[PDB]
Structure formats: C-alpha cells, structure tokens
Amino acid sequence: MAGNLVSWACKLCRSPEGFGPISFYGDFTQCFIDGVILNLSAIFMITFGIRDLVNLCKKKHSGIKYRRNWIIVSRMALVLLEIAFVSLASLNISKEEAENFTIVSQYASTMLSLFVALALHWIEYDRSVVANTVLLFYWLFETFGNFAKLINILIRHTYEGIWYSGQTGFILTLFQVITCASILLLEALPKKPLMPHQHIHQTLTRRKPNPYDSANIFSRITFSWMSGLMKTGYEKYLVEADLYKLPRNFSSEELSQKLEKNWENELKQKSNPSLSWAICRTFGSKMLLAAFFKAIHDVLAFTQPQLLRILIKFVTDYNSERQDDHSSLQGFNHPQKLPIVRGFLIAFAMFLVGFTQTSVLHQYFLNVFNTGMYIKSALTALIYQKSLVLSNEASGLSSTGDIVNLMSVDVQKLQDLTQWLNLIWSGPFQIIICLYSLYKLLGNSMWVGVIILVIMMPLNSFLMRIQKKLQKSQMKYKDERTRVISEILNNIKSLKLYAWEKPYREKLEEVRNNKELKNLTKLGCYMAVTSFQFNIVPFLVSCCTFAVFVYTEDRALTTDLVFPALTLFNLLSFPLMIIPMVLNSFIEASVSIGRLFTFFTNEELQPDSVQRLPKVKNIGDVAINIGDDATFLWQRKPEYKVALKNINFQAKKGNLTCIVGKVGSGKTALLSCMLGDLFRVKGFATVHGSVAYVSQVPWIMNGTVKENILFGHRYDAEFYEKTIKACALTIDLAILMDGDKTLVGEKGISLSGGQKARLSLARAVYARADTYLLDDPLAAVDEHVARHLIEHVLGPNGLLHTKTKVLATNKVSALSIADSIALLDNGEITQQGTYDEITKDADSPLWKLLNNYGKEGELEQLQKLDAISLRRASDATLGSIDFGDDENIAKREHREQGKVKWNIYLEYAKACNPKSVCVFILFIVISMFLSVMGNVWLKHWSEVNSRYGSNPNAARYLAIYFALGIGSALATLIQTIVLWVFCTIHASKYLHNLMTNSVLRAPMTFFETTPIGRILNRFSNDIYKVDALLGRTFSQFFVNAVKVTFTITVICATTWQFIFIIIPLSVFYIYYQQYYLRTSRELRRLDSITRSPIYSHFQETLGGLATVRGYSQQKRFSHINQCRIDNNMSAFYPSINANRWLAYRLELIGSIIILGAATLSVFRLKQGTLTAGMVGLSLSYALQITQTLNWIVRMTVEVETNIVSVERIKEYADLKSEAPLIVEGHRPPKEWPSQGDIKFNNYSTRYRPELDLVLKHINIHIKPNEKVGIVGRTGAGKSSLTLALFRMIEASEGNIVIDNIAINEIGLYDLRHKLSIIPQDSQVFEGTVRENIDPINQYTDEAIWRALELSHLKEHVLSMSNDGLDAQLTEGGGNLSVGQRQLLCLARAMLVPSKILVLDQATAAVDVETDKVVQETIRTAFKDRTILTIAHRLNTIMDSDRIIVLDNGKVAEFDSPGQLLSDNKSLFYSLCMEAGLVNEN
C-alpha cells in the first residue's frame, strides 16, 4: 500500500540531495525546507489566519480604539516588502528549478499566505488586544524557515563552490530573513498605543489588572509578564495592594457554579454519582493539554543523550579520518570527507532541544498548577455553600473540627494530586524510553543497572521510615523541653523570688543535653548514611553496568557507549524514585474524595418547612400561623424523634407572645420550627416579613463591637446610639477601653455573659425586623437590667411595640407585661390565651407559678435614662474585603534595603567551631574532586579501549574506577558526620545555653513588657529550626555550589575560551537570583497570612449557622467566603509563577552553557587538538548543570528564611542581665540575718526609669521580730516595697540595710536566698511535691514532713498517692485547689531557715477557711521571725504590733494601732470608716 507513496515522493523532488530530513552536511535539505517547513507554516497561516479573521470580524467592536501610529504602517510596509521579495524570488526561478514541484509550491503558498497576513495585521491592530498568536508563530516559523534556507545555500556554496539559486537567490533570501526577523520583532516587542479618550476611566479600578491577560504568547511562554512584579518586589516590600487582580477565569463564583452544575448533573442524571468524575469532566481539558506537553517534554528530554552520542561519534570519526589521511598523504580520489559544519549544527541542535524542552515543560506546569487552583477554589466555595444548608441532624453528626478539616486538609490533598497526576503515565513512559535507549546503547548489560536501582528502592524506603521515627522522637523531646520552658516562664516571678533559677536550669539542661541532643546525634548519623547511599548508588549503577559489559561483550567500551550511558542512568534515577510518592498521593486523595463525597451527600434542610411571605400591615394581623395539628421531627433518620406534636400556635403583629416551659419542654424547638430548622411531616406553617433571631447562647463575630451590632446593615448614627441606650449598653461600652472600636470574641476582649447577651440583643434591635424570635435572652441578664430591657425594647412602650415578638422565657417580669401566653409541655401545646384570661382562671398551673414566687444604685443606673412603623434596616453594599496587615508594614520599616545581615552568618559560624567548618567544607571539595577524577579516569579508560579496539586490562581499569567512586562516597559520609556531630550540634548546644542563661538572668521588666508567648515561641520554634533545618540548608547549598564550581572548571579546562561565556551568564544568574530571593520570600509571606482567615471564618460560620440562617444573611456570608478565597489566591497565583519565572531563566542559561561548551569544543576540533574523550567529559557535565542551578537558588531562599532564627536567638542572648548574683568579697556571714533589723535610709525607687517614683524618702526602722502591717490605697505603691527588699527593681535613691550591712553591695543570690517569702502570685511548678518544696534538696525529709504537718498539708499529700513526697502535680497545679496552693507556698516559706518573712496578699481573697489556718500558722509558728504583712483587708492588720501607712510613696504615718484609732482624723481611721470597721469600734 505504501509502495506507491515511496515512488510518488520521487516525482515531487528532483534535487540530488533528496527529500530526507537531515542532509550529509547536517542541515535541512533544500527540498525539505521548501517542501515541509515553509509549506506547513503557510498552511498553518492560511487555515488559522482565516479562522482568526472571521472571529475578529464576527466579534463586536469593543469601542476601545488604538491610535494608528508608526507601528501599523511599519508592519504593513514590511509585509508589502516581503511580498515584493517573494515575487522577485519567484521570477528568479530558473528553467531547471521550475521542474521541482516543492519549490514552486512553496513560493505559491507563501505568496498566498502573505496576503492573509497583510489583512490580519490590520484587523489585529484595529480590534485585538494582544498581538495575535497566529501572526507571531507564522513569522517565527518563516524566520526559522528562511534562516535554514540561508544556511543551506551558504553551506552548499562553501563546500561545493556553486550557488544553488545564483547570487540573486542568495541575496533575496538574506533580505527575506532580515525582513521576517524585523516583522517578528515589531510584532512582539512594542506596546500597543491607545487613544486619549478612554483614559478617564482608569481611576475607577481598585487594583491594577493582571498583566497575564495582556501578555502575548511569547510573553506567556517566557513568563516575562512576571518581570515587572519581580522588579517591584525586589525594590520594596510587597503590600497587598501591589498584587494584581486574578485573571478573568479565576473568580471563585464562576468556578464554583461550574462545578456545582456538573455535580448536581451527576446527582440527577446518574444512579451512581461520583464527585471525581464531575471534577474531571469540568477541569479535564487543561489536564489533557498538560499531558500533551509532558509527552513532548519526555521525548525532548531523552533526545539529548542521543545527540551527545551522535556528536561523540562525529568527533571520533573526524579525528579518525584526519589521522588516517594524514598518515597516508604519501599517495596521490578520496571520498567526500566529513564536513566540520555538521559538528556545529549538532551543537546548535542541542540548544534547540534544550530551549523547546524548557518551554513545553513550564507550559505543562502552568496548566497543571492552574488546574490545581481551580479545583481548590471550586471545592472550597462548594463546601461553604453546602455548610449553610446542612440539616441540624448532620451538623450534630459531625464535629466542627472535622468539617473545617475538609476545607483545610482534603482540598489541599486534591490540589497536590494535580501536581503528580500526569506521572502515572509519564513515569512508565520515561522508563520505557530509557530502557529502550540503554538496550540499543549497551545491550543486555543495562539490566544489571536496573536491578541495582530496583533493589535500592526498598532500602531507600526503609531509611525514610526510620528517619521518620527519629523525627517523631525529636518532636516529642521538643515538646518536653517546650513544656518545661513554659512552666519556668509562666512562674518566673516565684522562681526569682525563691532563687530557684539554678535547679530548674539544671533540670532543663538535663532534658536538653541528655535526651534531645543524643537523639539529634542519632538523626545526624542516619542522615549521613542516607547521604552515603544517595552518593554511592548513582556510581554503583554505572560501575556494575560497565563491569558486566566488559566481560560479557566483545565490543570495545568506547566513549559513545559510556558518557551517553551515564546521562541515561542519571535521567533514569528521578522517575523511578517518584513512584512511591505518586502512589501515596493517590491513596491520600482517594480518602479525601471519600470524605468530600460523604459530606456533600448529607441531608439538607427541607426548603418548604415554612412559607415565608411579605410582612403583614395592620397591628393585630396574624404574622405567624402554625396549625392543622402540625407535627415536626428533630430527625428523619435513623430515629423519628417527634420534636413537636399538635401545634396550633398563632401570634399577632405588635403583640408579645411568650412560650413557657422547662428546658427541653419544646420552647426552643418551636422557635427552631419558625426558623425552618426542623423537618415538617404534617401541617402548615407561615411566617410574615423579615425575621430577627437571638440564640440562647449569644453568638458573636470576632470583629468589632460596631460590626457585631450592624451585622452587615448600613450605619445610622441616631438609631445606633438609640439602640445602645435602649439596651443599657452605654455603661458597658464606656467601660471598654476603645469603646465600640474594641475587638470582640476569640481574638479580642472576652465579654461577660450578661454583657455578651446585651450585645446579642442589641444586634437584633438594630435590624428593625418585622418578626423577633427570642430564645430566652434574659437568662444571663440582671433583674433591674431586664426590667430596663422590658421597658425600652420588649414592652408596649418600647422601640419594638409595632413589631411581632416571640419571647421564649419563663421569668415573671416578662410574663406580666406579655400579651398572650402559650403553655407548651413536652412538645405539646396545652392551651393559650390572653394574660387576663388566665388571671381569672387561677386554677390552672400557669397562675400557680406566679403565686409561689411571690415577693438602689444599680437599679437607678439601669433606669438612669409616635414614630409609626420603624422602617427596616438596609443591608450595606457587599463590595470587597482587603486584608489588613498594617502592623506587619510597621515591622518592615526598612522598605527593603534588603542587604544581607552578614553579622548573623559570621556569628553562627562562630557558634559552630570555625575549625570544624573548614574541615566540613574541605571534605565537600575532596568528595567532588574524587568524583570528577572518577570520570576523568573513565575518560582515559574509554580512550584506551577505543584506541585498542578491545578491553585490555579490564580488572585494572575497573578496580581503579571503583576505588575513586568509593573514595567520593566515603568523603560524603565523613562530610555529613562532621556536619552533625561537630558543627551543627555544637552550635545548638552553644546557642541554647547562651539564650537560657541570658533570659533567666534578665530583669523582670523584660518579662513584663514582652509577651510570655513570644518568648516561649523563640525557645521552641527557633531552636528547632537551628537544630534540624539550618544545618541541612547550608550543606545542600555548599554541596551544590561546589558541584557547579567543579563543573565550570572541567569545561574551562577542555576549552579555555569558555571563560568569556561564564562571566556574562554569571551576572545574569546573580541578577535573577536576587530578584527571586526577595520577591518569592515576600510572596510566600503574603500567601501564608492570607490562608488562615479562610479557615477561621469558616469555623466562625459553623458556630452560628442558626444565626446566619435566622437573619437570612447567607448571601453576605457566602460572599465573604468567596472574597477571602480570592484574596489568598491573588497571592498564590504570582507566588507559583515566581518559580516558573526563575526556572525558565536558569534552564535558558543552562541551555546556553550547553551551546557554548559544544560550539567551542567543535572550534577546538578544527585546531585538531580535540579528542573524543574531551568533548564527552566536558559536555556530559554541562548537561547536568541545569538542576544544580535550581538547587542553589532554592537553597539560598531556605537559608535566608531560617537564618533569621539565629538573629532572634542572639537578640535575647544580648539582653542586659540584672545585677550580679554573687559578689565574692561582700558575701554575708552564714548567720546573716542575725536579728532582722530593717533600716531604710531615704529610700526611693521607680518601677521603670520612665515611670514616676513609687517610694519617696522611706525612713522606716523595724525593731527585730515585730509584726509590721502595710496599709495603703490602690496605686500607692505598697506592693513595690516587696520588690525593693529583694532588689527585684534597683534602688533609684537611698539604700536598705539589713543587720548593719547594705544589701546593695550584696549579690542578688545571697540577698534573695536568705529571706522567706509568701508571694502574691501563688504558683506551682509541674513536678512532684518534693520538687515544689525543696528542688535544691537542702533539707531532710523529716523537716519536710514537719513543714507539711504545720501547713496541714501532710494528710493531703499522702491522700493523693501512697508514695507521699514523690506524688506528681499537674501542670499549673490544676489538681490542687487555689487555697491548697497558698498552703503549699506556706510550706515553702516555713522551711527556709531565716529570720525575715514578707507576706503579700494584695489580692488574695479566694477563701476564708484557708485564710484562717494560714493566719493561725503565722501567729504560732513564725514567732521568731520579723514578719512584714501586706494585706488588702485591714482586719488582718488590726492585731499587728506596728503599722505602716503608705500614701503616695511617702511615710504617711508610722504609729501603733492604738494611736491610729485614737486619732479619728488619720488616714488609717478614714480608711477603716470606708470599710465600716469604725462602726464596729
């Protein structure tokens, strides 16, 4: 059948070169250029030209005129010029050349095509926004086609000495190349001009439009539209407003509606619906396009080793013929020698393959990640929309955390599947190509290498498993250390007061240095083994394959069988290793689809549960009618739980209808029926007008108080103030610091229940709804406040007198004013009627509940304070949400000077042993150098085989080659062991010890000002990053950096002229690296912060589904969810394309390196010095450089993100410590305090330098062993006297003398240790009872038991567990009562052998019985100690022998209790009169 075609092809082409694709000279033949490339591009231009022409003529003119400029006349001029040259070329055809059908058909088709192009340029300029894709590809293909025609003509002239179309044909084709190139540049480069008219509307847009929509096809391929964003993010920090809008197809509303339409189509039109089929039906097209580009990428990827094989064969045969003919120049026709130009065009073919592979690869990634974003947006919005209509049976079925995790986890899993979906076929497809390539290259010996890779797969999996086990144990010890630090920080006050810093620091170091770092050493060793395995296996595949080849095959192991084999094995390594990841992704995704499908199929609310209708007009009209013996069920499956039975409820406009009964008696169910939450099995139900609703639990959004009251309604100053006054919220609003601007709920200030209920009701009144459904709002409200609410809101004289009101409450006050009552017992309404009817019908129980109940500043404050038909509220325009990050902008005050803080890197290098860092870098060089010399020996081995034509001394060459591979592998083993054992672990031990010693030594002002959570975060997260992650990133960076440096010097050694290529590419590489570093880091930050509000909002919605469904604000809440999805995706879209912007440039740079190495090598072949080994070795290394450039840029980003952890750690390490703990010469005697003589010498102090004085000129002198009471008003600084005594805050003026030695000269340890304390903040450390009494183990157990006996704590300690002192205590002392903690603090205090005690009870009022026993123990046991008593209540002070009166930091009165009471005008007496003690006295 095909025999006719073979003969028919001979008739078309008459040139002796033939129709074949590649000529003898390595270029496209004349018949192939004219017959195929130019004809196909002409047919392409014709069929797609007229396609676009009819489309652009059918399409309506948009009205946006583009100004006719020098662009359009230049394009039309050059296209006319091109038509002229094609005409002249047609005339230049000779008589013999007319015989070729191909060339005449080429000029005919090109001439016809140019008229279509001439028209389409005009239509494109007039109407099309972007430069038309068809024109750009047409001029690209004809630039290529005419350039190939030029090179063909020039090669035939140079080698054969005849112009194949005359000099005229050469000159015309030269001008056609120049004309086509200039038309391509004028089409692609210049920006489209615009008329001045339409620019007035550019101020309406909020954000700039996406440049992707305006990007022509070359810009889309090269991703050059990202370049402007990269320059912006390099130059400054990216604010949210800088990010462009999403492209037109990415809106969450459009995607969700598309997937919703497909999904409900599956539900309706199939008996076995599947969510997966719906997804793959609606987003399946671009995945097919991605698969097509992946197939092209695989073919082009595996073309490169074959071109390398061709080139090495060419260089071998070129040198062979030079040596053969030069050695036989003695003789006198020789065949046509190999042309050197064939080498250059092979070198250029490698560039074209690398460039095309780069382009299709990133178009594959573009379509893949775009599909991932589409599936994420569509599923997220569908999940939210399904949440609003979940039946309460379904809502109670599943927990809130699981439903949020559907959005947060499962959708993220399906997004990740889209990345790896194409590898199910591309993996086998790449493997099948590679095995076929290797089989033809090496024969049967390939299978030994494949067996080794397959065998080493489970070994890799086993190492990953045990690595995961070690990582989990590392995380467990991290949590252990974090919890210990948390207890230390939370109880830092007691820790400093008792001088317990040393034992708890020793406890922390025992955990750290004994368990965590020991486990980290094990992790380091196993990572070293993993690195050794990853380094030896790529060698061992090639070494074993060549070993088996040489003995079994008689063929010579030449270079072409070796370096292409190494490249092919390297390409084989990746796809054979990703398959376990792909399969794991599929299983995880299959689980996620199961979760989502089960979620979407949950039972939804019955829409017809109630007929909701427009409002009723007249007062007294029936706004609610439930009747006909209506029956409603809580659940339809599995249990038919009848919620309500025989309901006949009816309510009228303006009247207050009350539902009364026990909890669960049906009252909350009947309100749920009005909302339509319950399923209606029988009866009819109606509700008229807008509904406002209040849940029994007051649900509050986490926004502002004003946002909670408005709740999407427009602002109105009069009603906003009026409702605040009506709800008695003004006093509560005034007490709040920022008033209505205060944040609310979980993130903001927590509100008390009665205050919370008032805010919830205030929302309802502001809506001005037609019907009010109130599920017991007065339960958490005080009586007098409730009366105020009954007067102004609910009463007939209130705001809502004209509105319908339903109030399910049982309080007597509400029932008295209520119009009609309904009695509801256990889901059955017994009887209803007006309140007057029941009053005379006293025999019924409704009167009885009133009977048995029976019978000023707060009431006055509550009571401190026509308009026919209050018009309803207006819902405000939804508009658009913009994320708020103003605090973050304040943090980034630098505005991206962005120069690297090299002081951090040097400080970290000094944290590691700097000598060990040099050793670590040394073994990287030794590793790579041996690996490079391993290939050099392989080059020498292959050359010897090629020269001999056999395999002489196979054992000798193979043994030496094996030795160098093991040498390189052992160097990586020693590299990673030195990394973890010596460098990384030493730095982690050094940094953590430096930080803990500094933080524990820091003064109290540091702990007070800084949040405790922030300090704990730096102890946990930053140390974890330094231990596990920071060492990893440096090792990956230096290994790849040294790898590229050895790759460069190998190529330069083979061809010294390559230096001139590296320098321009080096500056471009650094130029792209810096732009990616700043921009991609900032885009990831924006992406991260924008993720969380979507989940927090959805969790917030789930709490208040009843409220949202009550007010019918579903559309508003749905819109808010859609807007927050787009805000996150607006940051995610440029973040992803940042990678493809970078990866295109680096692969382009890598492709140019391959061109430079190949072409300069062939230039060296003309000199005659080149050998087959040199081009094989240098060019083989050049192919691998593209991956290493990607690693270096990526690891630099990882280094910068993690190195800030070292900066934060050093920030706390540099904290200025307080006064020294010990002064060597000034240490007091062991007996000190000998007596307890306290003397103050004009003492004065401030809490902080910036704060005013809190003590002034204190001259207090305390006799030994006197009971001193401290009395003072709030804010007098009475509590500051405690801190002054222990030097917790330094003395601004004066000094304190305890037993004729000033404590200022005494170290803080000697001061704080020798004094007994019962602090205000009673605190319990996590640990044993023994740990909380004597962590230093200074005292015997008998003394401890005596202390527990005196504290009345001995029996309770024995009761907790049989072990006694070893009994554990929970974190924070949760197991112990608050009063018990006071006794425990008392147990600590009495055990200290010192003669001075200070007792602080400035706020201790929890319980009196624990106070009484504490008091009696103080009087009895502590007789010999000088006691200072700081007490809130004066009753504890009246028995004191001496009393200090502190007022405004001065010594107001220092008198006995009798003198104070005798002086009725004293400050102490007046304070007692305020407390009422004077009345008793």
Residue numbers in the entry: 1 to 332, 335 to 857, 882 to 891, 900 to 1515
Share the article's original sentences.
ATP-binding cassette (ABC) transporters catalyze the translocation of a wide range of substrates across membranes and support a variety of physiological processes including ion homeostasis, adaptative immune responses, lipid distribution, and detoxification. They consist of two cytosolic nucleotide-binding domains (NBDs) that can bind and hydrolyze ATP which promotes conformational changes in their transmembrane domains (TMDs). The ABCC family also expands the canonical ABC architecture with the addition of a long disordered link between NBD1 and TMD2 called the regulatory domain (R-domain) in some ABCC transporters. Some of the relevant transporters included in this family are CFTR, involved in chloride ion homeostasis; multidrug resistance protein 1 (MRP1) involved in the secretion of leukotrienes and drugs; the sulfonylurea receptor 1 (SUR1) a potassium channel that regulates insulin secretion; and the yeast cadmium factor 1, which is responsible for heavy metal and drug detoxification in yeast.
We expressed and purified the NBD2 Walker B mutant E1435Q Ycf1 in the Saccharomyces cerevisiae DSY5 strain and in the Materials and Methods section. After phosphorylation treatment with cAMP-PKA and size exclusion chromatography, cryo-EM grids were prepared as described in the Materials and Methods section. This approach yielded homogenous particles from which we identified a single inward-facing conformation in a 3.23 Å map. The overall conformation has previously been unobserved with a 40.0 Å separation between NBDs, ∼5 Å wider separation than the previous widest model (G668 on NBD1 and S1411 on NBD2). The high-quality map allowed the first-time modeling of four phosphorylation sites (S903, S908, T911, and S914) in a single ABC transporter R-domain. The S903 residue and its phosphate group make extensive interactions in a highly basic pocket defined by the surface of NBD1 (L619, K655, H803, K805, and K807) and R-insertion (615–643), especially at the K617 site, the latest being consistent with the R-insertion of CFTR in a proposed alternate conformation. Direct contacts amenable to ionic interaction are observed among three of the six residues in this cluster: the positively charged residues K617, K655, and K805 at 3.3, 3.4, and 2.5 Å respective distances to the phosphate oxygen group. The individual PKC, PKA, and CKII recognition motifs are shared by at least one residue to the next kinase motif in the R-domain sequence: R905 shared by PKC and PKA motif; S908 shared by PKA and CKII and T911 shared between two CKII motifs. This stabilized tetra-phosphorylated motif (PKC-PKA-CKII-CKII) makes a linear segment completely involved or bound to basic charges. The cryo-EM maps of the enriched tetra-phosphorylated Ycf1 also reveal a continuous R-domain density that encloses entirely around NBD1 in a path resembling previously published Ycf1 structures.
